[PDB]
Amino acid sequence: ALLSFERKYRVPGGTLVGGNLFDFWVGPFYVGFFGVATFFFAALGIILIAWSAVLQGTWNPQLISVYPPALEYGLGGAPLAKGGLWQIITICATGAFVSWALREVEICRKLGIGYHIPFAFAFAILAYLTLVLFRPVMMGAWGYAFPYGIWTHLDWVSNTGYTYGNFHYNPAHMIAISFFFTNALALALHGALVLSAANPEKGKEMRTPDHEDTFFRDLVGYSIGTLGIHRLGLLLSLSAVFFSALCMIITGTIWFDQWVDWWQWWVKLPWWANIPGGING
């Protein structure tokens, strides 16, 4: 039930709500009030998904698909079978995601550590709400949100993207991708570096962090350092998600054309909009 070093940490205190009433563990899991709330939103949300699977007639998980209301409903309530389950499930999921984060805060308090982890998780929640709430509301219908199904939400991605031509040309989308790529790069590098120091060549004693520094200085002339690389990883991954939400919040709200058209603020500028030749002239 316990790690060998765990007992000295399992003390009372740190809860935001409920004092000591939910201050306990189940196996390895800490509960707390928000553990109870998480469970309740998750339980209900999973029931509704089952209820909806019954309405759909299948129990094949890769066919099940809960869609949101038709556009004609705009932003109003819809009947359960006609988009209303989607609405309720979205409420539950939001309840669960937010509860999960506040449970993490209670755990941070009990352990005496910073709040960076639930802070970072809030961006993933922000990104979810951008797709199911912020953007649909700004466009004026729930039906612009994505369906809850394994393959159908991929169709939604595909459909939404090609609505504005090649979505590659969205400039906030370019920025987001660059952070996703750079982040994978840095994660590989960070993992490799620590392991290569802790697990050196055969016949060698364990390396020091100075070897790590020396390795990157030799390789590219700069070492960001052990604190800096963790700062960087957090920065890269949150920025990738931030620009993701950004590239969608502006799509269909303040920009309605094919994104390749955006790039003419450059092509047809004053000093050269006319000079013959090249690709555009």
Binding site: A188, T208, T214, R217, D218, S223, L227, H230, S237
Partner: protein
């Protein structure tokens, strides 16, 4: 804020660190560069030294030729006009030979020959850089993890540019050198192969790309959260577990039911990242060689 340790409050500076010696040929290290106060807020301020040697120079050189070959072609497309060069910079493209040349190196320069030449320099630049990542580790007595991880990225690039076009029988199947044009190429590739969303190695690849952002957010944040206990000193935490490593592990155990070790999280990390391009490579490799239409292939489940 109850200070978050994202930026340093105070910077301190001392003599440049010239680095561990081990078996490094010290003849090939530069001098040290200047300190950067700007960078010092976020990470280390020291710039340099760097290590060069034969492979580094070969790699730099060969990489510059690559850049130069593309650049000169772009100037050619811009009719040697600077204004047109800047206007259309992102629309310029160096294309591979057309299909009718197959895999021959017998295409005229302005029709795919120059692409072949660029690819040759690019090919030399990357592999000699790979040799370098391997030899720097060796000279310091380190494990070869960095070289093996880099090989995973090289794999996806080899598939896109060389292995798949050879298997398809045509250089025209490779990726052009251009900002917008390799984007158009990417779009077009998916359309031609019946929607890559239904390529399962492509879905796997996306799971690890997302998974990488997930994990590095988890881990970056975890280390900052316990830096008040010196958590970022992970090598010494591996050798002699401190309350930093213990609280980090209990945070996740209590949240999620299980946890990592200070060494072990880095094994999760290296695999999460390298699986992105390992799987992606396989997915591209299979497209048009084995599977023409992923959507249709999918509806038969295989």
């Amino acid at each position: 804020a109850e200070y978050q340790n994202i930026f340093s409050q105070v910077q301190v500076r001392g003599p440049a660190d010239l680095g561990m010696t081990e078996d490094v040929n010290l003849a090939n290290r530069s001098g040290v560069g200047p300190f950067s106060t700007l960078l010092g807020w976020f990470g280390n301020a020291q710039l340099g030294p760097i290590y060069l040697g034969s492979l580094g120079v070969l790699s730099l050189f060969s990489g510059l030729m690559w850049f130069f070959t593309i650049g000169i072609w772009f100037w050619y497309q811009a009719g040697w006009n600077p204004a047109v060069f800047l206007r259309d910079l992102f629309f310029f493209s160096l294309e591979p030979p057309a299909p009718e040349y197959g895999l021959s190196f017998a295409a005229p320069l302005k029709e795919g020959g120059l692409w072949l030449i660029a690819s040759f320099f690019m090919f030399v630049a990357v592999w000699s850089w790979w040799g370098r990542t391997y030899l720097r580790a060796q000279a310091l007595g380190m494990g070869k993890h960095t070289a093996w991880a880099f090989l995973s990225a090289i794999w996806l690039w080899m598939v896109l540019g060389f292995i798949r076009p050879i298997l398809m029988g045509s250089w025209s199947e490779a990726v052009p050198y251009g900002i917008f044009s390799h984007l158009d190429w990417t779009n077009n590739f998916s359309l031609v192969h019946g929607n890559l969303f239904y390529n399962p190695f492509h879905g796997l690849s996306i799971a690890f790309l997302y998974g990488s952002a997930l994990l590095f957010a988890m881990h970056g944040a975890t280390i900052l959260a316990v830096s008040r206990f010196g958590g970022e000193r992970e090598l010494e935490q591996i050798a002699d577990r401190g309350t930093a490593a213990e609280r980090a592990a209990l945070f996740w155990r209590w949240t999620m039911g299980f946890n990592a070790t200070m060494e072990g999280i880095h094994r999760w990390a290296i695999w999460m990242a390298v699986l992105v391009t390992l799987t992606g490579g396989i997915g591209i490799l299979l497209s048009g060689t084995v599977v023409d239409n992923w959507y249709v292939w999918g509806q038969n489940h295989g």
